[PDB]
Structure 1
């Protein structure tokens, strides 16, 4: 039955939710019994490039708090050369663990989660940040709402959500790269699998994503608007791919009852 101090205040640990090579996430309670999540980052063995990234991720996290409620709260933090403590809002489950459990997704729930992903990602772009690594894990369900937990500035994994322009690049990265990944999450939330999930050979997967000839399948669904959103986000030419601002005005989000 452990405890910990963050900027004077004392928090009592209930359980661990996260495991990181150097980081851990703890479900904690404050003096008044309120629930929070504390991220403990161990800095004992990190280089300057890595530190500066964590410093930057934290600065942005703090700056974009005011801009949107679709971004995870950062109530307080304690930084030292040895460690980082971050008091942040608690969530029910991350979106990846929810998609692996929830078999059939409700169409209203899918649309509501999608609007949330768009508002959060759109906010970061306004500030010039491109996640470049969007995945379900990056989103937390809080109060039946989806919140973005990280910006991709600070450091098994999958290539399912990788845009074709990242692979052909081998800075060539733009806001549109996040549109492709968001499209892959939505395609998963729609057809229960990522667009290239079926390809086992990892090398062959990378080739498929970058291959114009390969045709991504869009099976006929009752939500005609949703089908259009997917076909527009998963366009290989980033110049031809739809933008976040345009997506906001799309019938799929704006229209009610389709």
Structure 2
């Protein structure tokens, strides 16, 4: 009953995570996808929150939603294939990243998060387990279930149950991410939850000898307990540390459109439909996140590889 519809469009491969995640192949294009499987009667608002955000967000550093399928018991989300693994696993594998490798990764995180804020959203659960590498070793932001329109990464105001601005909470989380990338351990860490809570509230952390003066200053600018003292996203885009070795601000605007359609992909898609080109373009432009949406976006991913 639950897998009947999904099997009309996808050939299932193995479970990789237990939401349960399955790898699969889109039958029509032959493209690999990841499928997130969530049970309705085992948080339903968290599923609807993520779906609503992903239907509205489309960006080179956000893991793309292709197709949404629903049954009485399950909701399936067909998503962009990211075989490079979690950033969390990558940092551990490397112990810690150099300042230069941290900047490569961090500029991509800044790009995705600045775009999310530009769209009127705040992620609210930024952490290395929520950033994946695709086949090109480019980062993709995942899990928009807690977004607004993990304790080690949470801003002090957010833990205290106080009112907060989502953008300020994201800037603090990005500061914790920045520290983890360059150190390979958390700035606030404890086995006891209350002792961790105390450490976050105090905002004091050890500064390893390998951190450069510029890294230390950026960390200080992001890790401010008072949210009004944290750096704004606008100032993060062209921060001196961010610009070092690059000399251009972070490109945060989306390169992945809703309006423009790719002519080659429209042609490839149209051969599978008993409709003219203009009818197919108008249907694609409705972005229903049905099989048509998945087919078009997967053909765009196939084109990108070549």
- Name the TM-score, length of structure 1 as normaliser: 0.83
Displacement after TM superposition at 1:56 (Å): 3.1
- Residue 207 of structure 1: SS of its match in structure 2? helix
Structure 1 residues 169 and 82, CA, compared in 2 at 3 Å: closer, same or farther? closer
Pairing 1:86–2:85 present: no
Q: Could you tell me which of 130, 139, 149 is aligned with 2:142?
A: 149
Hey, what does 1:12 align to over in structure 2? 11
Displacement after TM superposition at 1:114 (Å): 0.5
- Residue 15 of structure 1: SS of its match in structure 2? strand
| Contact 1:129/1:151 (<8 A) preserved | no
Displacement after TM superposition at 1:109 (Å): 2.3
Hey, what does 1:121 align to over in structure 2? 113
Deviates more, 1:78-87 or 1:214-223: 214-223
Once the two structures are superposed, residues 20-54 of structure 1 have per-residue CA deviations (whole angstroms, 9 ceiling, x without a partner) of xxx211111233432111111122x15xxx43442
| Contact 1:132/1:152 (<8 A) preserved | no
- Name the TM-score, length of structure 2 as normaliser: 0.71
Displacement after TM superposition at 1:133 (Å): 2.2
Q: Could you tell me which of 210, 231, 242 is aligned with 1:242?
A: 231
Once the two structures are superposed, residues 43-90 of structure 1 have per-residue CA deviations (whole angstroms, 9 ceiling, x without a partner) of 2x15xxx4344223212201111xx21111112121233211221111
Q: Could you tell me which of 38, 45, 60 is aligned with 1:69?
A: 60
Q: CA RMSD in A?
A: 2.3
Question: 1:166-181, aligned counterparts within 5 Å?
Answer: 166-169=158-161, 171-181=163-173
- Residue 163 of structure 2: SS of its match in structure 1? coil
**Count, aligned residues:** 240
Hey, what does 2:23 align to over in structure 1? 27
Displacement after TM superposition at 1:7 (Å): 8.7
Once the two structures are superposed, residues 200-241 of structure 1 have per-residue CA deviations (whole angstroms, 9 ceiling, x without a partner) of 332112112112xx6322234464322221111111111011
Higher strand share: 1
Hey, what does 2:201 align to over in structure 1? 210
Hey, what does 2:276 align to over in structure 1? none
Displacement after TM superposition at 1:5 (Å): 4.3
Unaligned runs of 5+ in 2: 248-306
Hey, what does 1:184 align to over in structure 2? 176
Displacement after TM superposition at 1:257 (Å): 6.9
